[model samples]
Target: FMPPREVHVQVTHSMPPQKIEIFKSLDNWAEENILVHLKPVEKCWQPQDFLPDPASDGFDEQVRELRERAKEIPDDYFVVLVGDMITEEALPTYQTMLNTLDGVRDETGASPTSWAIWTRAWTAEENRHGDLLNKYLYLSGRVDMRQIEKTIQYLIGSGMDPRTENSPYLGFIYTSFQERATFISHGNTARQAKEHGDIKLAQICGTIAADEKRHETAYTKIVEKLFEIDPDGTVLAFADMMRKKISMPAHLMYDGRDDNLFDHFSAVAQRLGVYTAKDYADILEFLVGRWKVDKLTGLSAEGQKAQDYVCRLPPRIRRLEERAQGRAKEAPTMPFSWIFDRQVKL
Candidate 1:
C-alpha cells in the first residue's frame, strides 16, 4: 500500500438482458497506491431468494432464460461430457458459454451438421466443466445447495445473455478470446486446488483445462473457416469486437459496486499465466495463421483480403505480443487500459 492515487471509473446498467457490468479505470497505480490495504469486496458474492427483486441481480430473469434456452437445445445437444469445476465458480461460465453457442447455432442455420459436429460435441464435453463444478462444491463442502440454487438464479442477472440479433460472427470473435482465456484461468484454479492438497479438484481442473484447450482449438478452426468465407466480415468482427466492452457479473449483483474500481480487476484474471490482451493476441494469431486471414490475403475479394490479413498479422501481433508479454512479466508504466487491452501483454 502506497499513497493516494487517482482511479478511473465507468458505470453501466441495463435490464434488457437482466445483466450489467461496471468498471473503474484502476491500473497498478491505484492498486499500488491504496496505502490502506483493502481486500477484494466482490468475492464470495451470495445469491437472492425472491424472483423479481429490483436489487437482486436478476435472479428472476436468469431462471426464465436458462429454462427458456434449454428448451431449444436438443435432447442430445451434446455428446460426451468431461471437465472439472473451480471453487464452484462456473455457474456463470457454464451458462454463458451455452447461451453464446446456442445463439450461433440458431443464427448460422447450421446444425451440429454445419460444424465439424464439434461445436455441439465440444459443448457437450465442456458441459462437464460445470457439472464437475456443481458436484465438487458439495464434495469439497465449499458451497451449500441453497447457495448453489440462489447463485444459478443470480448468475443470469450477473452474466451474459447474448443478443441473438447481433451478427453471428461476432460470437466467434468473443468466444475465440474467451476460450483461450478461460483455459488459462481454469488451469490456474485447478492448480490451486492441487496446491491445497485437494487432488480431486486439482484433477478436475486439469481435465477441464484439457477440455478448454480443445474447445479453443475447435473455435480457432472455425475462425479460420470464417476468414475463408468472408475476410472483410472477419475484419469487421476483429475491428468491432476489439473496440467493444464486456461485463463481469459482480456489478449486476452489487448496487454501485462498479464505482469502487473493483470490476476492472474482475474483468481480468492471472490464473495459469494468462490475462486479457495476451490471450486476445494469441487467439488473433492462431486465427490469422490457421486461415491466413490478413491484409495481404487479398482484401479486395474477401478471400484475397483474408490471405493478406494472414500475411500481415504476424508482425502486428509480434510487436504487440512482445509489448504485452513484457507487461505480463511486470506491469507497464502506463496510465491507460486501452479498450483493446487483453491478454496480449501477459
Candidate 2:
C-alpha cells in the first residue's frame, strides 16, 4: 500500500518521522532499475564461527582461548578492536557486494539501482569508521599482521550475505539494529578494558564506541523517520528483516535467493549474546515506543504486520535461548547426547 491510508507518504526515505517531507531522501534512482554485470569472482571461502575449530584442535586450549578472548573484549586492545577486522578488510568487500548486487526490486524493478547507490554512500561513512578502528588496532600492535589477515580473510571471505534482499528498507532496518548492537559491544569492550587496567585499550575502544554511537544514532533517526512516514511498510519491511536476517551477503546472493539467512543469524544471535530478541525489542522500544510511532502517525498494514511480529519475537527467542542453554550445559559432558532431549522438547 500507498500512503495517507498506509503511511504519511513523507517517511519512506526520510529519517526521524517529524522531519516528514523535510527529511532528506537518499538517492533511490538506481533502485528503480536492475543492472546485471557478470564480473570476475573469487571462490567462496567458508568461515565457521570460532567455537568449533578451537574445540576440534584441543578442547582445553579452545576453552582457555575463548575465555581469554571474552575477557579481552572488555579488557584488551587486540580483542576490543574487532571493528578493525570487520571494516578494513572485510566490510569493504561486503560494501562492494552491496555495490555489486544488482537484482530486481519492486514491481518496477528500480529499487536495486537506488539501493546500490544509497547503500554505497552509507557504507562510505561506515567503512571509514571501520578504517579508524582497524588503524588503531594495527598501530597498537596488539595483534600480529598474520592473525589479523587470517581472521579478516575468514570473516570477510565468509561474506556479508545481506539479510533482507526483499526490500532495501528492511536491509536498512537490519543494519540499524546491528549498528546499535555493535555500539553496545564496543562500549562494553571499552568499559571492560578500563576495569582491567588497560587504559590505552579502553581509551581507544572508547573513541571507537563513540563513533559507533553516532553511527547508530544516525541510522536510528533514519529508521524512526521511516516508521513515522509509512508505519505499515516500516513494520512489514522490518518484519522482512527480523523474519529473515542473514549472516552473510553471499547468502542473499546464494544463487540469487534467500537461503537459511534467518536461521543462520537467529542461531548466531542466540548462541552469542551479540544481538538477540532481548536487544531487538529493546531497540524497538527505544525508537518506536520512545517516539510513540503507533500514536504519532497512523501505522500502515506493514507497520502493524511488523509490530505484531515484534510482539511475538520474545517468546520465540526465549524458547531458542532455552535450547541454547541446554546445549551449552550438556556440552562439557556430552556432545551429541542432547539430540533425544531436544527432540522431546520439540
Candidate 3:
C-alpha cells in the first residue's frame, strides 16, 4: 500500500518588523481599493436570488424541474461541483488564515482597520458561494449530502497550511494565485454545465466565478502596489512563493474514507478539464507579466536571480503539464464516497 502523504497544520510565525510596517502603510490604500471592488451589502446578490423560494406555492414544482435539469449533468461533474462547494464551505478556515498575517489580523474581530474591514467584507461575500452551492447540490438529489457535510466538518476541524508562514507578502501572493485559479476552475465548470444542459448550474458557477474575478483583482492590485513599494523584497517573496508552490486552501480535505481523497478529487477535476496543470502554469505567466517582473531594475543580485526564476517558471511547468497529460491517458478509475462510492474514470 502507498504511504499516507504528510500533512502540515498551520503554525504561528512572526512577521518581520519591516514587513509589518509595509502592511500597515497599505491600510488606507487597501480601504480605497476595497471600496472599488467590494459591493455594498444592500447591493449584493443573495443566495435566494438564484434558488427556488421555499415560501412560494410553486416550490415543489421548481425543485422538481431543478432535479430534472440536474439529471443531465454527469457524475464526474457532480464530483467536481461537490469538491468546489466544500472548498467554499470552509470559509471560517480561510478567514482565520487571512487573520494570521501580521498587519491584517482583525484583533478584536471588529477592528476599524481597513485591512480588517477588507477581510470581513470579503468573507461576507464568499459566504454566499458555499451556501448557494450546497443548497443547489442538495436539491439536485445527485449526491450524498451527509457524506459531503462530513467532509466539510473534517476539513475545517483538520485545518490547512497555505505555506505562507504568516508573512503578509507571501499571504497576498498566495491568495492572488488562488483567486485566479478558482476563477478559471469555476468559469470552466460553468461552460461545461452549459454544455451538459444545466443552465441554472451554469449561472450559479458563472456568478461565483465573477466574484472570484473581483477578488483576484483586489489581491493582484495589493501585490502590484507591493511591487512598487518594495520591488526587491516583493520580487523575492514572489519567487519564494513560486518555489515553494501555492497549496490549495482545501488540500487537507478528507471525506472520511479515502486517504488520498484530495488527490482523487483533483485528478477528476483535471480529467474533466475543470482545472488543469496548464492553468497553473498560465496563472504564473499572467502574474509575472502583470507585475512586469522583467522590467524591474536596480534589484540586488539575489532579487535579480529571483526575477529570472519567476520569468522562467511558466514554460518549465507547461513542459511538465504535457508529460502529465500524456500519462493521464492511462490512468484508472477511482471510487468516491461523496457520490455514494461511484467510480470516476480519469
> lDDT of each model, Cα atoms only?
0.42, 0.45, 0.89
Candidate 2 local lDDT, 1-346, one digit each (tens): 1111111122232223433222224333222221111111242111222132533757566545444543444212233244234444466664554442223122232334344444544555455455555554444433444544544554554555453442345555666666666666666556766765655555655665654565566556556656665666666666665665434332221111113322332343333444455665566556555445445346665566667666666567667656866676421211111011111110
lDDT of 3 by residue, 1-346 (tens): 2323336554556356666877777778887876589988998898998898899998999999999998888999999999999999999999999988886889999999889888999999999999999999999999999999999998888777788888888899999999999999999999999999888889999999999999999999999998998899899889888887888988878877888888889988998999999999999999999999979988999999999989998999999888867775577988888889988886
TM-score per model over all chains: 0.50, 0.55, 0.96
- lDDT of model 3 at position 186: 99
Ranking by TM-score: 3, 2, 1
Single out the weakest 10-residue window by summed lDDT for candidate 1: 75-84
Clashing pairs in 3: none
Model 2 backbone overlap count: 27
Select the stronger candidate by lDDT from 2 and 3.
Answer: 3
Q: Give the lDDT ranking, best first.
A: 3, 2, 1
lDDT of 1 by residue, 1-346 (tens): 1211222242222112311110022222223432112223252111221112346677567445434433332211110011112223445443344434422332343443333233444444554556555543433222234534443444444454332123446565666666676676666655654554545445655766775676566556556655665566566555554444333222232222123322333333432242445554565566556654433344556445444454555467668757865775553321111211112221
| Model 2 local distance difference test score | 0.45
- Which model is ahead, 1 or 3, in terms of lDDT? 3
Off by over 4 Å in 2: 1-84, 97-128, 139-144, 154-158, 246-281, 290-305, 315-327, 330-346
Please tell me which predicted candidate would have the highest TM-score against the true structure: 3
